[PDB]
Enzyme design. Structure first.
Site, PDB file in Angstrom:
ATOM      1  N   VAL J  50       0.833  -1.221   0.000  1.00  0.00           N
ATOM      2  CA  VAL J  50       0.000   0.000   0.000  1.00  0.00           C
ATOM      3  C   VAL J  50       0.874   1.282   0.000  1.00  0.00           C
ATOM      4  O   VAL J  50       0.566   2.270  -0.697  1.00  0.00           O
ATOM      5  CB  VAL J  50      -1.030   0.035   1.166  1.00  0.00           C
ATOM      6  CG1 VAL J  50      -1.826   1.398   1.217  1.00  0.00           C
ATOM      7  CG2 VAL J  50      -2.010  -1.161   1.087  1.00  0.00           C
ATOM      8  N   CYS J  51       1.964   1.249   0.782  1.00  0.00           N
ATOM      9  CA  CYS J  51       2.901   2.384   0.920  1.00  0.00           C
ATOM     10  C   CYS J  51       3.330   3.069  -0.399  1.00  0.00           C
ATOM     11  O   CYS J  51       3.164   4.288  -0.519  1.00  0.00           O
ATOM     12  CB  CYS J  51       4.127   1.950   1.735  1.00  0.00           C
ATOM     13  SG  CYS J  51       3.629   1.005   3.179  1.00  0.00           S
ATOM     14  N   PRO J  52       3.887   2.310  -1.377  1.00  0.00           N
ATOM     15  CA  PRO J  52       4.234   2.953  -2.661  1.00  0.00           C
ATOM     16  C   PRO J  52       3.036   3.618  -3.389  1.00  0.00           C
ATOM     17  O   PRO J  52       3.199   4.674  -3.998  1.00  0.00           O
ATOM     18  CB  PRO J  52       4.834   1.814  -3.509  1.00  0.00           C
ATOM     19  CG  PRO J  52       4.392   0.564  -2.879  1.00  0.00           C
ATOM     20  CD  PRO J  52       4.199   0.874  -1.377  1.00  0.00           C
TER      21      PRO J  52
END
EC number: 1.11.1.24
Lengths: 196, 196, 194, 196, 195, 195, 195, 195, 194, 196
Positions: J50-52
């Site tokens: 999810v981060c990127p």
């Protein structure tokens, strides 16, 4: 320094016991002796003083008005039982009490005064504090007067009557309620019967 | 657990400040605004309830009897100023207050209630506590009622009058004193004028 | 058991309201500097042993005053009760008029400082203190409730402390004015013992 | 502050130690004296001045105590060996000579400190005398500064008085001796004494 | 177990009343600066081993004074008991006249500071301390109650410390005046050991 | 100054490695129960006064053994150092062969328990302890570094404690075997003193 | 486990008596400021692995001196023990003459400060410390008792710290003088790695 | 400065997620019981000296495995960064495929327990630990950031500890397989030193 | 700053009086087990942003209920004030009748447990909490006073937590039902990123 | 219990550290952003999932923040060296590719803990986003559990709303966007909004 006491409204009145003068005799007396009855428990500063005897006499002469509504009265000061008795044996004309039908409780150790939050540390006696305690031993009302100003038997009676009314009925007593006055159903719908 | 408060009779009343509704408007109000006048400062449990509006209205309709003896009245509950205002804007018929001349002070943080020792920790509001504060800011009288039973405007007036009388004269007020009643010289020789 | 009263140290300061010649007066330990003081507590006004002790000392006050000694009585009673007791005739267990101050200790501070306060009773036992002219405590006598003190014994002690204050010599058991005294020296003591 | 375990109307603090009794070392205990009154007294130091006169004064009048069921014990911080030497020293040399009163040794100072008579700056006691009843209760405490000896007459008067009040429902007035008037400690009964 | 007395540190200060030449005098430890001091405690006046020890040091006091050393005895007894004991003849277990001060420690402070107080008994054990002319504690000897000290051993030790104060050499086991000493150096020591 | 060594109380327990007859052995204070023990500390191996004291006692050990008394010496040095020192000839300040155990107190715990450890130096002073057959501490002798102890005085003390353990009498100042003793009683004592 | 020795912080200060060229000298950590120092503890004089390590470094000292680096060895033994050990021939497990100071840590304070002291044994493990010319601790090597250290590895480390002190580059695993180094930058590093 | 890692005590327990053969696996210290373990920390993934050290041990892993020894590397990086680094080619400062587990210590608990966490920087220094087959810590090597460790030295030490575990002899300075060892006895040692 | 509210731990228990369909009822967090709960605090009855937020959620309640989610609003006001506000017409800033419970927190206990109580003001800020069907706290949104929350954003979050509860996959930035999701595996994630 | 230094309506807790900005290591400080709004967000871990998407979502819409005087900074516990590697990893490999948002490193975890977003059991942050105004005051806190990403639309709506209320004496209703009706926060003024 800040104010400490065991007396809390809607909680059991702080237990007390000690020696009282009752019909000219020394007797063991304790808060729980009054379980089953309302109690008006009041402190006054000092035997052989000024406002004090008038309040004891005012209640004492009207005692039957309390007894007919199942209510007892007890007065208390930090004086010894021996001073209480000597004061009772002093004629009313000399600032004495004369014969009295209200027990005079002695609080020589000051523990009862401190528990009730009426002890004046700088003076060594109490202010004018009155406590209405219900038949279940629960504290319902606290009235504290500075020294110069006495209490009212009329107001004490009205309060006892109002607490006994609200004990027995679903309703609550508005400002200034006397027997026969209108009351309120403590319900957001019910209340409208009174407010209309 | 035992009972704590900053309110002590014969000591300065605990300082308070907050937002009040005064003639339909939000205003800064503080205890010291009343320096120079007697103050009847009383708490009531909750806006939109039952005994509460009758007490505010009882005092409010008789406010001139307090103002003519240099006495102000302030009512306080834990409700917000917005609730106070909405309650004022509710017709008396619906358990509302209608227009009112007594400031309604808001104690949303509960700090004022705790300082005055009238906060009920289990309920989140106050009991019925009334405080008489003199023109010098000194607390003279404390009256605490359990929830079901309202206060008396007559008794509050009598107390204010009696404290103002004893402020001005060397004498003290016996039980049940009203303007024009006999008083006592608080002297073991002087007192005999009254007791005879 | 705690107290501020220690023999050979300054007597604990006190101050309060006394009844003196029928009137309320502020009285303080320091008012007695320059004189010996017999300062005694009794339990309670309108009791039994207490009036006899107060009356005993009052009626014999001159025997203290003629040797530069004053007498003060103290109980936990109020000044208003002290005054009522004084206005009560002797034959009724009252004091009658009295020439000895009656100090009131309503707060119990003085009684506690002197170690004579009974926590469970709310009053003092029978405690007597002899304090010298420099304000130093010399003698403590504490009696249980049922037994009164002796003016004769108290007078003897005052006289002995005054004698030993004045003279290099000390006072044997039972010493009264005119009795033999002892030089407190290992060689000097021999004049007494031979 | 002054600390002590000795309290009037409570058990006298327990003690035990070596005493010289009739020329010999013996273990002595406060509880050895249960059933009898006990005059228990401290004196500063062996081979001093007032001390031998008090010990001899009590010793020569010992039958006066023994005939009223009362024993006498003296105590100082000196060792038993010094007590014994002092006894074996002629009276004319400020010695005691033979004596019938035990001399209790308190070398560790624990007894003196328990009785509140130890002088920390000096390392010995002041002149403290204690009257302990047959039930082991402390009735009377007499503390003299160093220069001034105690009175056997007065100690006798006190023992007699405590024994009289133990047996009768009457109390002893100021200066009471055997055969003197006593008081009934009741507000009505007292009048028999006072009406005079 | 605690005390203020530590070897190679200043001896703990003391002061009190001593009997000196039949009289009561204030005596302080600092009165001995500039001299060695043999400062010893004994349990109790009018006892058994104690008089023999006090008399042994007293009767031999010149053996100390001629090497610039003083002797002071101390017990928990009062000065009045000390003087009574002195006024008791030797045949009766008394001291007789004595040339050594008898210090009184009635409060027990001195005994506790020196670590010689017996809490259960209310008196000291037999503790002896050798203090140098600069006031530094050099030696501590503590005996249980039944066994007295030796004046000869105490003399030997005072002599040894005075010798080592004065010279750079140290004193072997059993050293007496005239005996071989040692240079406290890994090379210098060989002059002693190679004999 | 803190220590667990108190006269008339059990000597503080110790255990450790000792060199005995040139071998490493575990040794414990309680190994000596049933006999007197002379337990003494000395500052450091390969020094000066220390070897003379070990040798002084070692050469006269039969005088101890014949009164049922053992001797144990202790320093903070390791057992490896003790053995090297024993293996160094007496003429180089070494010990040569010795019949006294050399106990190692490398952790310093034993020295601290006996109150002889010098915190600023890392080693002990000259502390000697006489411990009875029941393990009770009877005598404490502490010397500052420059002055050695005495075998004669140590024997005298041990003989005196054994005498008073066995008889009802106590030992006067300077007592040796054959000297007069005292009955520790106010009456009995007069047999000794009446002179 | 507590210690004051932390990499990249000033090495904990020490001072004490060392044996240097057969003489007792006061030595201080700060005496070495301005040069690298290899400071190492060994358990005990007159033992086994310890002399081989002292001799290993001592025999190769010129390799240290020629990179401006000194060596100091330390155990809990006394300076008197250190000197005896130096005076014992190498063939008897002795050190013989040596050019490295032998520091004495008799009080154990230095060992405790360096976190190498063994509380149950009374001596240190084999702890070696590399300290830079500014007094900063750069390297810590602690061996359990049975296994000795390496002079080669110690030289390698000192040479590597001196290289990285002087140049912008860092030293890969196994680096020796003449090996490839790395520019410590995300871009610059690719000069080294691109293989 | 504190840690739980003490030589001759059980190495502090650890567990976490490691990358092993390109996969995430739970790894615990006790998984290595019965084998020696070289357990080493390196500062940060995608840096400079660290890849060279990981590759040096990895490429030489058989030299450990053939002496019953395993190798585990650890940093504070996540397992996702470890796997990304592994999937980075060596020429770019990546690790490439590697046969050594890369343990993740994101919470920092393992690093602090091992005393290698740098509070001001948020990562470890270069700390290497040798743990025996019974789980006891035998050796600790801590390097400041700029200088890598030696696989050769680490091998030497593992070999030395395994040799001393098996035989009663101990390992001199610079010992390698085939080198002379010592009998840890004051007599037995002479067989080594007399050569 | 202190609170018992921690993401991924059980939501702090609460209980109190709510107004539900014009009546006073005891309500408890545990009554919502089996369902998602949007539990939000607003500052004060008879104010400004607060009625708009309560009305926004009330009028859209079915969008929560059709995905097994309930909604509860809470302020420090009494139940009597809540009921008066409900009996006030919307055009006067009142709520009008409302299908969402109004929980009363007079004692301030619940507000403090949730970390949303403003000590100097005596009421809460705008704090919203998404609690899953197992009673676990999933999401916290706290707004300063002048800015209201979004029902659309709250719905998106509820849907995303429900999606990820049900499926092995995770929800990218801006995810709405029908958007791409990610397998949280280093190899598996590649199907999304390619 | 949950501890944090982040409090709405108080200064956002100060931070400083190394960030990757346009491919380079740079010291970054919260106070660098005074004068501008700041969206400050934490994400769990580099090289995850999810981060990127969140970082790229914000990065590709950055001019939408920059045109309203608002900057964006992302933070995780990863080192700057890992941030830089992640940037240098193609988007198709779940890398970031080039990005205009600084990636702040919080290796020591002090920043995460100060912001109350650190997960002690996991060693990295949850998805915490913080809206800090141009005066450095924290206005808004959004915390998501791990599985669920944040919304750029919603973050934009909030920034706009706080900026609108900073400038005007009106407040933003539920769901407000630019051009929506607002309310005057006065009991009389509010009616202009509500009468509708």
């Amino acid at each position: 320094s800040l104010h400490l006491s065991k007396a809390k409204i809607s909680k059991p009145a702080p237990y007390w016991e000690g020696t009282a003068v009752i019909d000219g005799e020394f007797k063991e007396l304790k808060l729980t002796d009054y379980r089953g009855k309302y109690l008006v428990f009041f402190f006054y500063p000092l035997d052989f003083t000024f406002v004090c005897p008038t309040e004891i006499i005012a209640f004492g002469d009207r005692l039957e008005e309390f007894r007919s509504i199942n209510t007892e009265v007890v007065a208390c000061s930090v004086d010894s039982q021996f001073t209480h008795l000597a004061w009772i044996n002093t004629p009313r004309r000399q600032g004495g009490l004369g014969p009295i039908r209200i027990p005079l409780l002695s609080d020589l150790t000051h523990q009862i005064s401190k528990d009730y939050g009426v002890y004046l540390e700088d003076s060594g006696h109490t202010l004018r504090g009155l406590f209405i305690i219900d038949d279940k031993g629960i504290l319902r009302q606290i009235t504290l007067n500075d020294l110069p100003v006495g209490r009212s038997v009329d107001e004490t009676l009205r309060l006892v009557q109002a607490f006994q009314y609200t004990d027995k009925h679903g309703e609550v007593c508005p400002a200034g309620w006397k027997p026969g006055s209108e009351t309120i159903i403590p319900d957001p719908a019910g209340k409208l019967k009174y407010f209309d």
